[PDB]
C-alpha cells in the first residue's frame, strides 16, 4: 500500500493556485490563500477523508468535494465563529474568502479606509505600522 | 583560612594562665570548662577559644610557652 | 550480589584498557561500575574528584550543550542507551570497550600553549576531558540540521573514533592539534 499509484498528481490545480501533492493533504491544502492549518483540517474532516494519504494520492471527485466544502462552508456545518470574513461590511454575510478574492477584498477594505480618510487608512497610505506600535527603533529596513 | 584573632588568642592565654590546674587535653571537656568559667557570649568563639586552649596545652605539655 | 551490568545489559568486566597512561583517569572497572549513567553528582567539589566519576556518566554529562538542552540529563541517558545499543548491533562488541578505545584514540597526546606558542604535552586528565568533549561536539556537529539522529551520530562517531579512521571529527582535530604541536615544537 506504499507504492506510488498511477494518476498520482504531483501538482493539483485548485482555485488558480498550485497544490504540491508530495505533502500530506491537510498541510498541502494550506498552499492557497484563505485557508490555514486548522481550517484545512476541519474542512477535510467534514469531507470524510483518510488523512494518511497525500494530496496527490486521492481522486478528482474527492478534490471537487473538498473545493465545494471550502467554498461553501455554512452549507456543510462549518461554524460561524470559524470564518475569516465574519459579518462583512458590504453584503453582511459570513464567508470564508479565498485565494484570488482574498487580496481583492483586502484591497477593498484598504482603499475604503483610505477613501473615508481614517487614521489607519492614512497610515496604510503612508506605509507605516497601523496597529499602534512604536516606530522609533524597530522596523527600519523596509522603510529604507 | 583558620587564623584565630587577637580576641581569641589573648583570652585563651588568660584562661590558661589563671586556670591551668582545671584545664585538660580534650576539646569537649575544656569547652564546658570555659563555658562555666567565662561569660563568652556565643558558641562559635566559645569553641574557638576552647580549641586554642587545647592547642596551647599540647604546647605546654611539650615545653614552656612564651 | 556481584555482576552489576551497565543498563542491566552491558558487563563492566571483559573491558581491557590496553594503555597504561589512562588507567586511573578512566572509570569502567568494578568499584566505578554503576547501573545507570545517572548519578547524584557531588563530583565538582575537589580538584580530581572529577576523575572518579564513571566515564559513561561523564559522556552523559558532556553531551548536554548548546543552549536548547542544558540540563536534560534523562534525555541524554536515553541518547546514550540507544547509542550503545546501535554501537553493539553495528560493530559487534562491548560498547564500553569501544568507548574506552574511542577515548584512548581520541585524546590528544600533546597540545600547543603560549608560554608564537610552545608545544607541551597534556596531563592525562585533560586528555580524558578533551577526548570526551571532542566526541560530543563531533556528534553534535554531525547531527545538526540532519535526518540522521544524534543517537546515531554519537554511535558512528564513537566507532569511527575507535577505529581512528580519520573520518571521525574528534580524530581529525586530534591529529591536526598534534601536527600543529610538532610544528610549533
Amino acid at each position: 500500500s506504499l507504492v506510488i499509484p498511477e494518476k498520482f498528481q504531483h501538482i493539483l490545480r485548485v482555485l488558480n493556485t498550485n497544490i504540491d501533492g508530495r505533502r500530506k493533504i491537510a498541510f498541502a491544502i494550506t498552499a492557497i490563500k484563505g485557508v490555514g492549518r486548522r481550517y484545512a483540517h476541519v474542512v477535510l474532516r467534514k469531507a470524510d477523508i483518510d488523512l494518511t494519504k497525500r494530496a496527490g494520492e486521492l481522486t478528482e471527485d474527492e478534490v471537487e468535494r473538498v473545493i465545494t466544502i471550502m467554498q461553501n462552508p455554512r452549507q456543510y456545518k462549518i461554524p460561524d465563529w470559524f470564518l475569516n470574513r465574519q459579518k462583512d461590511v458590504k453584503d453582511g454575510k459570513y464567508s470564508q474568502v479565498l485565494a484570488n478574492g482574498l487580496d481583492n477584498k483586502l484591497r477593498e477594505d484598504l482603499e475604503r479606509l483610505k477613501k473615508i480618510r481614517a487614521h489607519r487608512g492614512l497610515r496604510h497610505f503612508w506605509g507605516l505600522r497601523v496597529r499602534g506600535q512604536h516606530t522609533k527603533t524597530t522596523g527600519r529596513r523596509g522603510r529604507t | 583560612g583558620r587564623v584565630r584573632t587577637k580576641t581569641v588568642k589573648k583570652a585563651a592565654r588568660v584562661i590558661i594562665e589563671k586556670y591551668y590546674t582545671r584545664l585538660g587535653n580534650d576539646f569537649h571537656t575544656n569547652k564546658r570548662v570555659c563555658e562555666e568559667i567565662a561569660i563568652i557570649p556565643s558558641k562559635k568563639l566559645r569553641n574557638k577559644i576552647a580549641g586554642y586552649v587545647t592547642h596551647l596545652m599540647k604546647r605546654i605539655q611539650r615545653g614552656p610557652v612564651r | 550480589t556481584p555482576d552489576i551490568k551497565l543498563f542491566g545489559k552491558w558487563s563492566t568486566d571483559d573491558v581491557q584498557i590496553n594503555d597504561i597512561s589512562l588507567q586511573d583517569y578512566i572509570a569502567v572497572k568494578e568499584k566505578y561500575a554503576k547501573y545507570l549513567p545517572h548519578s547524584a553528582g557531588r563530583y565538582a567539589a575537589k580538584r580530581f574528584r572529577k576523575a572518579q566519576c564513571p566515564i559513561v556518566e561523564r559522556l552523559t554529562n558532556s553531551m548536554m550543550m548548546h543552549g536548547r538542552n542544558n540540563g536534560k540529563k534523562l534525555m541524554t541517558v536515553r541518547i546514550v542507551k540507544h547509542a550503545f545499543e546501535i554501537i553493539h548491533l553495528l560493530t559487534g562488541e562491548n560498547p564500553l570497550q569501544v568507548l574506552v578505545n574511542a577515548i584512548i584514540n581520541s585524546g590528544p597526546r600533546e597540545d600547543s600553549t603560549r608560554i608564537r606558542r610552545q608545544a607541551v604535552d597534556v596531563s592525562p586528565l585533560r586528555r580524558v576531558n578533551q577526548a570526551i568533549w571532542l566526541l560530543c561536539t563531533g556528534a553534535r556537529e554531525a547531527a545538526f540540521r540532519n535526518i540522521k539522529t544524534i543517537a546515531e551520530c554519537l554511535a558512528d562517531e564513537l566507532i569511527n573514533a575507535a577505529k581512528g579512521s580519520s573520518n571521525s571529527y574528534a580524530i581529525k582535530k586530534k591529529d591536526e592539534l598534534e601536527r600543529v604541536a610538532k610544528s610549533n615544537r
Partner: protein, 141 residues
C-alpha cells in the same frame, strides 16, 4: 486481583478509551470535530476519537482523587501557551470539553456530583475501571 494503580496508566487509558467506544453510549457533542481542545493548543486533536480517550483519562483521575470539577479538570489538562515573541506561560484547558465529559460520565453512570462540590467516581465506574485494570494486567502477562 489487581486494581488501577497496579498497572501502567498509559495503556490503561487507551484500553478504557476502546471500552467506551465499543460501549457506544457516551453522548458525544457535535462540535467535537470543530473544537480546539484548549486555548493553548494550536491545531485540532490529531486522533479523531479523542473524546473517548479524554473520557478515559478524566475517569482515571476521578478514580485517583475525587472532588474534581470543571476547573480542576482545566487545571489538570493545562499546558504551555507559547505567546509568540512574548514568553510562554501556563494556561488552562477548555472548560466546555471538561464540562461535557463530566456530564457524559454522569449521563452513563460512572461519576456523580458529590456534595463538597465536584464529581467523584461512583461504585459502578469503580468496578468498571478495576475490571479493565485486571484486563490490562492479564494482557501484559
Amino acid at each position: 486481583g489487581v486494581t488501577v494503580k497496579d498497572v501502567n496508566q498509559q495503556e490503561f487509558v487507551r484500553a478504557l478509551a476502546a471500552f467506551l467506544k465499543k460501549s457506544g453510549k457516551l453522548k458525544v457533542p457535535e462540535w467535537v470535530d470543530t473544537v480546539k481542545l484548549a486555548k493553548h493548543k494550536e491545531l485540532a486533536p490529531y486522533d479523531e476519537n479523542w473524546f473517548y480517550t479524554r473520557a478515559a483519562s478524566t475517569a482515571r483521575h476521578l478514580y485517583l482523587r475525587g472532588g474534581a470539577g470543571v476547573g480542576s479538570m482545566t487545571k489538570i489538562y493545562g499546558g504551555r501557551q507559547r505567546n509568540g515573541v512574548m514568553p510562554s506561560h501556563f494556561s488552562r484547558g477548555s472548560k466546555s470539553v471538561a464540562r461535557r465529559v463530566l456530564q457524559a460520565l454522569e449521563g452513563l453512570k460512572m461519576v456523580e456530583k458529590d456534595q463538597d462540590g465536584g464529581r467523584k467516581l461512583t461504585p459502578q465506574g469503580q468496578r468498571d475501571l478495576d475490571r479493565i485494570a485486571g484486563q490490562v494486567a492479564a494482557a501484559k502477562k
